[PDB]
């Protein structure tokens, strides 16, 4: 408890955002 279970889910959110950025915005 105490701001928990939310930050762990966002840890993956950044991996998807940065994962689909250098390869997605790098081949246009």
Swiss-Prot record:
Membrane topology designation: Peripheral membrane protein
Localization per record: Host membrane
Protein name per UniProt: Non-structural protein 5A
Provenance organism: Bovine viral diarrhea virus (strain CP7)
UniProt lineage: Viruses, Riboviria, Orthornavirae, Kitrinoviricota, Flasuviricetes
């Amino acid at each position: 408890s105490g701001n928990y279970v939310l930050d762990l889910i966002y840890s993956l959110h950044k991996q998807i955002n940065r994962g689909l950025k250098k390869i997605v915005l790098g081949w246009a």
